[PDB]
Scaffold this active site. Structure first.
Site, PDB file in Angstrom:
ATOM      1  N   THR A  40       0.400 -10.444  17.584  1.00  0.00           N
ATOM      2  CA  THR A  40       0.059  -9.719  16.358  1.00  0.00           C
ATOM      3  C   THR A  40      -0.766  -8.337  16.775  1.00  0.00           C
ATOM      4  OG1 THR A  40      -1.149 -10.025  14.393  1.00  0.00           O
ATOM      5  CG2 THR A  40      -2.211 -10.888  16.128  1.00  0.00           C
ATOM      6  N   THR A  41      -0.680  -7.334  15.879  1.00  0.00           N
ATOM      7  CA  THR A  41      -1.370  -6.242  16.316  1.00  0.00           C
ATOM      8  C   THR A  41      -1.608  -5.378  14.691  1.00  0.00           C
ATOM      9  OG1 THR A  41      -1.525  -4.090  17.083  1.00  0.00           O
ATOM     10  CG2 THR A  41       0.818  -4.903  16.607  1.00  0.00           C
ATOM     11  N   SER A  65      -3.036  -9.199  19.883  1.00  0.00           N
ATOM     12  CA  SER A  65      -2.654  -9.141  21.099  1.00  0.00           C
ATOM     13  C   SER A  65      -2.509  -7.578  21.415  1.00  0.00           C
ATOM     14  CB  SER A  65      -1.635  -9.894  21.515  1.00  0.00           C
ATOM     15  OG  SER A  65      -0.532  -9.391  20.498  1.00  0.00           O
TER      16      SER A  65
END
Lengths: 229, 203, 231, 203, 240, 230, 217, 196, 249
Positions: free
Chosen positions: B1-2, B130
């Site tokens: 996830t970002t 991440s």
């Protein structure tokens, strides 16, 4: 169990009536008195029983709470047992925490606070008793009085119960400083004799005395009779 | 996830991918990771998905009650502080929550980063998840406070695309919101599989 | 009369007056009827709105697929007792995956009601429930007075002007035991008509709910009862 | 462990009618020397001193808590508390946390009664060690035991007692890396209290 | 715990204990508050100056916050509890939300607190009627409120509470105008003078600027009192 | 006498509930009318003195995006009920993500009404001396309910509570037409509130609110417009 | 010493149509490597238009099913109406998350018809997070099913801003056959899937039930 | 991880601290100001877990402000330090905060003071303090150049030198430090040491 | 059980609480005590109500108590409840000195005790404490302070005030005679004069009196001390001589 409504409220005159009823209730109890000699203290009370069939030896009115201290009560008997038990408990708590006997003043203050509790807490009546706590400790002989209001005082001599006024005046006229312990014992026995209807005998009254630095001991009938003889 | 967010001249942008993965498996490529709290306020999902969803639902309810009580929409500062306190109450239980509370106050745009540890920061650039470092790499490089929304939205899309390309756990659909002077709007959403060949043409 | 202010004070005649005030609370409710056959129970209630514009207050209720309730007395307590009964039926279903027998729910309800008539700070419920449901034996009808007592009848009525319906049933209750669904519905309608003070009966005044060994609980619709009344 | 988190050296030793209590003077995270003027000895009243070796924080807490109880005893009883009684009090309030113990190793020393010295140290849960020649506590325990065992004499004037406790403490602390940076010695006599700060190795 | 319905309905729908709380309010020191355009003045009847009181360590107009001030009328014993809880809430709001409490918020909190007491079992209602004041943050627009023993509250252009509250209220109803600067203090002083004619040595007055509260000095109150005492005689002579 | 809070009267009616019902008779008149377009509410503010700020006297409070509430009786005790209703409606939104029906909110407010008592079984010691109108819109269309301190409620097509109850209700029955356009519905409520109110109807003396799809408290300028239309 | 959980295998599938919803799950139940029963139904009809199909620890699956059924009955009694599907999905999410720190070991896939009558399928974690998706499958065989379903039923994402239209919707007779094929392929290759396949086909006509024979070994 | 340190001049007590807020490897922020103002005449630099740092510092500021308004006289610096130590020590055994605190202040009748409060709740009135890995360099350099009568110019020169060394020799060298001074005028911000 | 409840915490139709007013009456029936705030100290003097000759009098005090090194109090009213209140007050002072490590300013001690009293005054249905206190102490904040506490849980600072029996006469004479700058000796003399002039018996007896003064030792140490009987005798003789030394003209 609400039971949280003070049954001892303030009468319109500022007086705490129920405490006054308790003071009367002690006022109708058997007499007791105490004197402090210059070198010891003495407390005595009348132990007249309704019948011969009652074994006078099965109960004592003069009871010692710590080897330094003893108490006499006037008024309702059952309440004095409550107070003696609780005072013994507090004395032993003090001894647990500090390995020393509790000073007379501290024991008196704690018993007085116990007395006071019931004059504010809800659902209970004040103790129908007043106590004469005799003790001898590191700072001299001491005689303390405690009343259902929870207030306590230091007396040179005092009395309470039936026949308070006559015993009180008798002590006031006959008391003097520098009185020895034996003089105090004789004086106390005489004061009891003053109002004691009937004839005194070792099985009619109870006496307890603290010598110099020594332990509070309750005189046995075999020797109280020697004192009064 | 970002996920990222940054304030600039014309408001605060928010961007985020759409991948949800457990272990090495992509459980889905369509999770909405920008959580509408308020027509003026957007939170963001990072870390545990269940935790973020639940606590942002609680945050929305607290904000609604605050509005009803005080007849005034809660400022970004207050919402951020409520969430920070709530998560702090669960300090040792092992929650996972990192969420930018981007919005617009009466006093101007606001953006705050909140953590499951109870830590709260306020800043003009953030990114969580991440692929956070890649998003920063591109964002710090392209960022300028004066840029227009039409290119701020392009920067926010390019940064998340780069994070997705480089990061295994990020990918899916880049979804870009713009929290303007009045309220937010989804300015664009694109599929990373198509973005890549948009930016690197097949020739 | 000084034996009257607190529930826990018996009167020298052997009476408990606060409980009797509660039991009087029911009499101000509207006529809640109920009549039982060996398979069916029919709870009918007379609806009285507090104005031409304002609407009435609901009095029939569902407790689970096989139990219904018709309350009389103050509604604030009918709501709590109905919620309790629903909760108990649900809990029993959850534990044993079977329907709670009427009788046991009724007795638990009577225990719950009696508990309030024994403690100083509590007051009786003041709502008289007329429970009707199903057991393995078939249909059953009960009545729970706020006193904590409960009874079982082939038919019964409570609430204001409930004497006329009661007195019709006492004429016809001999037939209910073997009566079909329709005949019980007809008897409920007529027993209500006996309550109306010279008004022609219409669907707009009463609601009829029926439970049967093969049917779950249901409240008959506004129009079907009207059509039946047109006979 | 946790006792040598700060490190301390405290000694007490009995003279003719005088008592002497000594101590170190440094606070340290572990080996960082934040302050060369720490206080491990506290006067509770004339003729009664307590040294609180072990963890510094536990020491401060016990000192403040003990002051509370002692003052309230003075108001209620009107007599300063006698040494042995104070040792019993400290033992009780240490044992109350039998399972949460304070990490202190108190040393208690003070004249009283007919001007008669009293010394005792206690386990972290109040086991008293009423001694008559000397008492030692802290991280330099073994070194202090050796130094005092080799340097004590039965009945010692105030000046001999000062010199002996000083030499014992200093020679015993020079052999310890968590303690030193000066010294703080009291000589308490029934007519006089002398509080000395010693020149030590600052290394 | 002691549960007893101290507050209960009277056969005609009145809360007798709440109304007796209101009467207890009537017996309290008069207080006045006059919201101006740029300041919000407060005043009270007695500054504790009966020639022997040592009033160094207590002021009647009390800060709940540098943001906010409070004047109370009625029992003084209850005022302390209410003010402590209001201060605690003023801080706890900053903690829970960075923003400081808006005047209406703390007023509402006090009001709800009072209502809870008028309805909670086994507890006596507060015999208070507070006046609250402050500048809502980021607004610089003054604000004036009050609560009453019933637990209901509302804003005001100006108002008074305590003994003779009515007479001061009529004075304000006839003499209020949108004041500024010293004019607000003038109106507050006149309003109090209506009932406390022994001016100066009895009033205690504070003024709320956007930057906080500050209480007037004896010389300042005396200056205003002298100004009014001269100008009123002048106006009366001119008219008559 | 020291009759208990929960004592039944010889005819079966709790005393304190009756004494509370009496308390609404003293409260401000509040009136509402249902219609197809929506629901309207009105209430006399009772602004005693010109100093009082009219806007700060709120007697119609939002419970949620679709549930108004007109308060009468003790407005102090009404706040608490509305706060309870607000938290309940939000909980239902939290626990299902859908608005709580109006009839259920009414039943939520009413379920709190009778909890009073003594003996640590409930903190409340006295009934809520408040009767409310709840005007909302939900899947069933416009709906209007009202409650009283007896913990009971019931849907109504038009109702007026507070002091003017009897007169307003008579005038409502005489005139509630069931074809009302929202325009007509609000003028009727305001005309009734006019006659009951002793003071002249002014933009500041009255508080009007339209539920319609979304709650809206009429601003003073909007009130002047309808006062003129009347 | 003892493990409070058990993995009872099986797999559930849900396919959301334009006007229907098809839910399937095999009837095998097992532990370790031995089959406990061959008639354990994963599907529970929670509401008139919701159907929960879950896989995982069987006791927790039943506990969750009964909890949701009870909570729905309470909702019916209070709000006098039957819980809509999305409301049930939200309730299930909250219930799962309330036990965050001792989770249900169940992997749930709600299906059903929403208020307007469009089939909607919600897919859940074991801790509550959920999505509204056009299909899903959870349990042992899920990873074997997903590639085929994805390949056969792909539509532009719902998050695309220049909305890119929608794929031709599939009729019921085609969703049924697709679920049949998915389970055939999952049983061939998964040890935990097999026995029968309960395909509850919600419609506007009310839900049916269909069974197919999967392989036994 | 944080670095903080103090310094007591003739009439002032400086506190400096790094201003970098991080997560694992990312400096989410380099403007994070960590030195709080408790009063017009107090500073409270804190180091420790960011959530605990903020929550504890806010709690202590609440209590300081509550004392101020209720009595009318502000807490003296020593009393504020002792109150902090008490709260931290009580929390120590029940739900410990992981914050290390340096408290500076000025009181007209006592002058500048600087208190050392460790996360173990050990309190000491130190002449100079420091927390974190920069503590070694800060303490050594202060010891080398510290005097008891430093002009604010000398104190700020010393703090600049300490900052330069901490940057040069630490691996986690934070780039930005804030310097706050307390004097008769009151707690204040002296200067910001931008590096980047 | 309801019928046995007196409902102590309740408003009368007048808007005032009865039990607290009865408490003030009970104070009025108790022994008198007054306080003088001098420039260089604060003086408390009290009347021992019970004065039977058999009383020991060797106990240092019956009405004045030390609450801390810097604060003392003089009690009027029901001493039974006053013991509890002083125990609590000492506890509160030590609780402050533990939390903050410094003496608890007098005003705060007074306020904490008054908040204890108001609790009984407002909720719980217990009778209020029938006591009233005069507090003498010293702070860095404000120096020497004197406070008076009603059993209502209300208190105020007084340059000189009196409580207990015959309160108002002493109050009036203090109004007439107290002046600023009253020093140690002048405060002591004024207290003795006003009391004896308020006493039913002139030429007072040391056994029936208590005098305590909280002054500041040269080395900034607040020293509380209650005068021994012989010091009382010396002051009594000096005052009984100085009163005619002024009344002669």
């Amino acid at each position: 169990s609400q039971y949280s409504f003070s049954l001892t409220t303030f009468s319109p005159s500022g007086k705490l009536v129920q405490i006054e009823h308790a003071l009367t209730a002690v006022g109708s109890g058997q007499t007791s008195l105490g004197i402090k000699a210059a070198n010891g203290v003495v407390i005595a009370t009348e132990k007249k029983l309704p019948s011969i069939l009652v074994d006078e030896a099965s109960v004592q009115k003069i009871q010692l709470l710590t080897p330094n201290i003893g108490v006499v009560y006037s008024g309702m008997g059952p309440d004095s047992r409550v107070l003696v038990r609780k005072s013994r408990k507090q004395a032993e708590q003090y001894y647990k925490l500090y390995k020393e006997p509790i000073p007379v003043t501290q024991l008196v203050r704690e018993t007085a606070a116990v007395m006071q509790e019931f004059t504010q807490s809800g659902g209970v009546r004040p103790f129908g008793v007043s106590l004469l706590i005799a003790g001898f400790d590191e700072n001299g002989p001491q005689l303390y009085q405690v009343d259902p209001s929870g207030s306590y005082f230091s007396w040179k001599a005092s009395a309470m119960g039936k026949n308070v006024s006559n015993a009180k005046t008798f002590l006031e006229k006959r008391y003097t400083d520098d009185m020895e312990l034996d003089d105090a014992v004789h004086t106390a026995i005489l004061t009891l004799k003053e109002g004691f209807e009937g004839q005194i005998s070792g099985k009619n009254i109870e006496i307890g005395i603290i010598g110099t630095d020594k332990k509070f001991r309750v005189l046995t009938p075999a020797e109280i009779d020697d004192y009064l003889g | 996830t970002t996920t990222l967010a940054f304030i600039f001249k014309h408001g605060v942008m928010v961007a985020a991918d759409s991948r949800a993965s457990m272990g090495g498996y992509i459980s889905s490529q369509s999770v909405k990771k920008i959580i509408e709290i308020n027509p003026y306020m957007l939170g963001t999902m990072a870390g545990g998905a269940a935790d973020c969803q639940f606590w942002h639902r609680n945050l929305g309810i607290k904000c609604r009650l605050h509005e009803l009580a005080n007849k005034r929409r809660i400022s970004v500062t207050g919402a951020s502080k409520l969430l920070a306190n709530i998560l702090y109450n669960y300090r040792g239980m092992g929650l996972s929550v990192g969420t930018m509370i981007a919005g617009w106050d009466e006093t101007g745009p606001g953006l705050y980063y909140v953590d499951s540890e109870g830590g709260r920061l306020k800043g003009m650039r953030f990114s969580v998840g991440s692929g956070s470092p890649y998003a920063y790499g591109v964002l710090d490089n392209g960022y300028k406070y004066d840029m227009t929304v039409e290119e701020a939205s392009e920067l926010a899309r390019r940064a998340i695309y780069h994070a997705t390309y480089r990061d295994g756990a990020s990918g899916g659909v880049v979804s870009v919101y713009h929290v303007g002077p009045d309220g937010w709007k989804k300015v664009t959403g694109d599929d990373v599989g198509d973005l890549h060949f948009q930016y690197y043409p097949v020739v | 009369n000084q034996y009257d202010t607190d529930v826990t004070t018996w009167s020298p005649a052997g009476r408990l007056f606060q409980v009797e005030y509660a039991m009087e609370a029911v009499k101000q409710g509207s006529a809640a009827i109920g009549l039982r056959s060996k398979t069916h129970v029919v709870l009918a209630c007379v609806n009285k709105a507090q104005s031409e514009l304002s609407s009435h207050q609901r009095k029939i209720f569902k407790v689970d697929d096989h139990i219904g309730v018709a309350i009389a007395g103050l509604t604030a307590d009918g709501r709590v007792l109905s919620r309790y009964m629903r909760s108990e039926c649900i809990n029993y279903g959850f534990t044993y995956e079977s329907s709670l027998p009427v009788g046991r729910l009724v007795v638990q309800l009577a225990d719950k009601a009696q508990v309030c008539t024994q403690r100083s700070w509590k007051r009786p419920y003041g709502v008289g429930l007329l429970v009707g449901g199903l057991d393995e034996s078939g249909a059953h009808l009960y009545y729970n007075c706020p006193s904590g007592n409960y009874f079982e009848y082939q038919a019964f009525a409570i609430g204001s002007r409930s004497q006329a319906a009661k007195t019709y049933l006492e004429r016809k209750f001999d037939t209910f035991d073997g009566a079909t669904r329709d005949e019980l519905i007809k008897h409920a309608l007529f027993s209500i008509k006996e309550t109306l003070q010279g008004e022609k009966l219409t669907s707009s005044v009463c609601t009829i709910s029926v439970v049967g060994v093969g049917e779950p609980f249901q409240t008959l619709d506004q129009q079907m009862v009207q059509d039946l009344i047109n006979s | 462990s946790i006792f040598e988190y700060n490190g301390s050296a405290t000694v007490a030793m009995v003279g003719k009618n005088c008592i002497a209590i000594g101590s170190d003077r440094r606070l340290g995270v572990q080996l960082q020397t934040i302050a060369t003027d720490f206080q491990r000895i506290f006067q509770i009243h004339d003729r009664l001193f307590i040294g609180l070796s072990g963890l510094g924080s536990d020491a401060q807490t016990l000192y403040q808590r003990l002051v509370f109880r002692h003052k309230l005893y003075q108001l209620r009883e009107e007599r300063d508390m006698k040494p042995e009684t104070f040792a019993n009090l400290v033992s009780a309030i240490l044992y109350e946390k039998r399972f949460g113990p304070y990490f202190c190793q108190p040393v208690i020393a003070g004249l009283g009664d007919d001007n008669k010295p009293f010394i005792c140290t206690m386990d972290s849960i109040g086991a008293k060690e009423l001694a008559k020649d000397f008492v030692v506590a802290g991280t330099a325990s073994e070194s202090l035991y050796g130094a005092c065992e080799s340097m004590y004499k039965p009945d010692m004037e105030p000046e001999e007692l000062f010199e002996t406790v000083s030499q014992a403490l200093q020679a015993s602390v020079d052999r310890d890396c968590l303690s030193g940076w000066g010294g703080h010695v009291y000589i308490v006599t029934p007519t006089e209290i002398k509080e000395h700060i010693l020149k030590g190795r600052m290394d | 715990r002691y549960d007893r319905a101290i507050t209960v309905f009277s056969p005609d729908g009145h809360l007798f204990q709440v109304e007796y709380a209101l009467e207890a309010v009537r017996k309290g020191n008069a207080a006045v508050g006059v919201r101006g355009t740029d300041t919000v003045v407060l005043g009270v009847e007695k500054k504790s100056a009966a020639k022997l009181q040592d009033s160094r360590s207590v002021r009647k107009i009390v800060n709940l916050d540098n943001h906010i001030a409070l004047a109370c009328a009625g029992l003084k014993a209850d005022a302390r509890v209410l003010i402590n809880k209001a201060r605690i809430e003023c801080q706890s709001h900053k903690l829970t939300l960075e923003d400081p409490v808006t005047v209406e918020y703390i007023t509402r909190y006090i009001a709800g607190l009072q209502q809870k007491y008028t309805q909670s079992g086994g507890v006596r209602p507060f015999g208070l009627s507070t006046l609250i004041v402050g500048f809502d943050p980021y607004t610089d627009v003054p604000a004036l409120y009050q609560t009453d023993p019933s637990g209901t509250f509302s804003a005001w252009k100006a108002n008074a509470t305590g003994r003779n509250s009515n007479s001061i209220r009529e004075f304000l109803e006839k003499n209020y105008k949108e004041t500024s600067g010293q004019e607000t203090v003038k109106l507050a002083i006149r309003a109090l003078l209506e009932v406390v004619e022994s001016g100066g040595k009895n009033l205690e007055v504070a003024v709320m600027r956007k930057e906080g509260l500050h209480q007037l000095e004896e010389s300042e109150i005396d200056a205003i009192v002298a100004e009014i005492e001269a100008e009123k005689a002048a106006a009366e002579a001119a008219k008559k | 006498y020291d009759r208990g809070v929960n004592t039944f009267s010889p005819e079966g009616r709790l005393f304190q509930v009756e004494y509370a019902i009496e308390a609404i008779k003293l409260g401000s008149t509040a009136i509402g009318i249902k219609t197809k377009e929506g629901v309207v509410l009105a209430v006399e503010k009772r602004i005693t003195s010109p100093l009082l700020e009219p806007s700060s006297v709120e007697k119609i409070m939002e419970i949620d995006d679709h549930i108004g509430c007109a308060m009468s009786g003790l407005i102090a005790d009404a706040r608490t009920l509305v706060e309870h209703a607000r938290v309940e409606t939000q909980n239902h939104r939290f626990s299902y993500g859908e608005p709580m029906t109006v009839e259920s909110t009414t039943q939520a407010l009413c379920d709190l009404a009778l909890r009073f008592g003594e003996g640590d079984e409930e903190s409340m010691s006295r009934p809520f001396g408040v009767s409310l109108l709840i005007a909302g819109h939900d899947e069933n269309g416009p709906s209007l309910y009202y409650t009283d301190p007896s913990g009971t409620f019931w849907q109504c097509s038009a109702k007026a509570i507070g002091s003017g109850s009897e007169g307003a209700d008579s005038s409502l029955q005489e005139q509630f037409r069931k074809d009302l356009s929202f325009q007509e519905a609000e003028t009727i409520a305001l005309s009734i509130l006019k006659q009951v109110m002793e003071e002249k109807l002014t933009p500041n003396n009255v508080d009007i609110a339209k539920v319609s799809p979304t709650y809206h408290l009429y601003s003073p300028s909007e009130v002047e417009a309808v006062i003129g239309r009347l | 010493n003892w493990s409070p959980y058990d993995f009872n295998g099986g797999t559930c599938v849900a396919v959301a149509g334009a006007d229907y919803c098809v839910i399937a799950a095999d009837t095998r139940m097992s532990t370790g490597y031995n089959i406990l029963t061959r008639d354990y139904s994963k599907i529970c009809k929670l509401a008139e238009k919701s159907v929960l199909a879950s896989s995982g620890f069987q006791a927790d699956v039943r506990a969750l099913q009964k909890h949701l059924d009870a909570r729905h009955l309470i909702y019916q009694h209070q709000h006098n109406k039957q819980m809509s599907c999305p409301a049930m999905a939200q309730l299930l999410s909250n219930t799962l998350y309330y036990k965050r720190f001792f989770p249900y070991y169940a992997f749930n896939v709600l299906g059903g018809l929403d208020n307007e009558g469009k089939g909607c399928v919600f897919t859940y974690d074991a801790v509550g997070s959920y999505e509204k998706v056009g299909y899903s499958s959870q349990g042992s065989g899920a990873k074997l099913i997903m590639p085929f379903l994805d390949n056969q039923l792909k539509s532009p994402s719902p998050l695309l801003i220049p909305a890119q239209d929608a794929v031709t919707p599939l009729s019921e007779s085609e969703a049924i056959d697709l679920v049949r094929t998915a389970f055939a392929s999952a049983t061939e290759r998964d040890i935990y899937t097999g026995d029968k396949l309960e395909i509850l086909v919600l419609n506007k006509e009310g839900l049916r039930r269909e069974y197919m024979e999967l392989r036994l070994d | 991880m944080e670095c903080v340190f103090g310094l007591v001049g003739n009439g002032f007590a400086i506190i400096a601290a790094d201003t970098s807020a991080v997560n694992s490897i990312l400096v989410h922020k380099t403007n994070e100001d960590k030195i709080m103002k408790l009063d017009s005449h107090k500073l409270m630099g804190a180091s420790g877990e960011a959530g605990d740092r903020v929550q504890f510092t806010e709690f202590v500021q609440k209590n300081v402000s509550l004392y101020q308004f209720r009595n009318g006289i502000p807490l003296t610096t020593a009393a504020a330090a002792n109150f902090t130590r008490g709260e931290l020590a009580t929390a120590l055994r029940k739900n410990p905060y992981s914050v290390n605190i340096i408290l500076a202040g000025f009181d007209q009748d006592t002058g500048p003071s600087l208190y050392f409060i460790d996360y173990i709740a050990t309190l000491h009135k130190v002449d100079k303090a420091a927390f974190g890995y920069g503590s070694y360099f800060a303490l050594a350099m202060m010891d080398r150049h510290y005097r008891s009568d430093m002009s604010v110019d000398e104190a700020i020169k010393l703090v600049d030198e300490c900052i330069a060394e901490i940057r040069t020799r630490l691996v986690v060298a934070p780039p930005n430090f804030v310097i706050k001074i307390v004097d008769k005028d009151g707690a204040r911000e002296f200067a910001w040491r931008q590096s980047i | 059980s309801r019928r046995y409840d007196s409902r102590t915490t309740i408003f009368s139709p007048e808007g005032r609480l009865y039990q607290v007013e009865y408490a003030m009456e009970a104070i009025g029936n108790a022994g008198s005590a007054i306080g003088i705030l001098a420039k260089d100290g604060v003086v408390l003097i009290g009347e021992k109500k019970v004065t039977s000759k058999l009383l020991q009098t060797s106990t240092s005090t019956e009405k004045m108590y030390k609450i801390d090194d810097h604060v003392a109090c003089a009690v009027a009213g029901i001493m039974s409840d006053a013991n509890i209140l002083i125990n609590t007050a000492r506890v509160q002072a030590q609780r402050y000195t533990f939390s903050y490590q410094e003496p608890m300013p007098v005003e705060q001690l007074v306020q904490s005790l008054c908040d204890t009293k108001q609790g009984y005054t407002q909720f719980g249905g217990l009778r209020p404490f029938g006591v009233s206190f005069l507090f003498a102490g010293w702070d860095k904040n404000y120096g020497f302070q004197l406070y008076m506490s009603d059993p209502s849980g209300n208190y105020g600072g007084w340059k000189a005030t009196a409580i207990g029996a015959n309160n108002q006469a002493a109050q009036s004479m203090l109004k007439q005679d107290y002046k600023d700058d009253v020093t140690r000796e002048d405060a002591v003399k004024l207290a003795l004069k006003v009391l004896s002039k308020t006493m039913d018996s002139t030429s007072l007896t040391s056994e029936k009196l208590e005098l305590a003064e909280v002054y500041l030792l040269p080395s900034g140490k607040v020293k509380y001390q209650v005068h021994s009987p012989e010091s009382l005798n010396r002051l009594l003789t000096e005052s009984g001589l100085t009163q005619p030394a002024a009344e002669t003209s």
